[PDB]
Ligand binder design. Structure first.
Ligand code: CL
Length: 155
């Protein structure tokens, strides 16, 4: 059972959205039981909390699940086959956490339009609904490449 996890700071906005969106797609693709998808944060001040409301609101609006319980990065996540970081600071930390460079990758690097220098997924925490809608757009735009990665592994 392949294991892919998404990582941001608080695990209440960006990472949780990626997790659910990806999970959903995997389900549509009949790959539900082949891949395990989670998300965790580098910080510990939101641990156990539900996903940010504005985040849930956008997921809901697009028909995605919103059930979520924030977790801090732990042994569980550090053991995933692929750690996907939302921005480059998350990437730096997972790296300092012991994960080898190759198992750590930024979400946008999977965007089919991405260049060599991956882009951060801007944090929408200090904005409103539209900002999360934007983040959804950015994430949706990146996931396809993550699917290519999964397909390859499952083969
Ligand atoms: Cl967050």
């Amino acid at each position: 059972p392949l294991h892919v996890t998404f990582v941001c700071t608080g695990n209440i906005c960006r990472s949780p959205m990626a997790e659910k969106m990806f999970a959903q797609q995997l389900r549509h693709r009949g790959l539900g039981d082949a891949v395990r998808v989670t998300s965790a944060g580098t910080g510990n001040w939101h641990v156990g909390s539900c996903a940010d409301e504005r985040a849930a609101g956008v997921l809901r609006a697009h028909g995605y699940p919103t059930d979520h319980r924030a977790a801090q990065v732990g042994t569980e996540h550090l053991a995933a086959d692929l750690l996907v970081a939302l921005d480059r600071n998350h990437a730096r930390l997972l790296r300092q956490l012991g994960v080898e460079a190759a198992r750590v990758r930024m979400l946008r690097s999977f965007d089919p339009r991405s260049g060599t220098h991956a882009l951060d997924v801007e944090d929408p925490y200090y904005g409103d609904h539209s900002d999360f809608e934007e983040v959804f757009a950015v994430i949706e735009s990146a996931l396809p490449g993550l699917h290519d990665w999964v397909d390859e592994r499952l083969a």
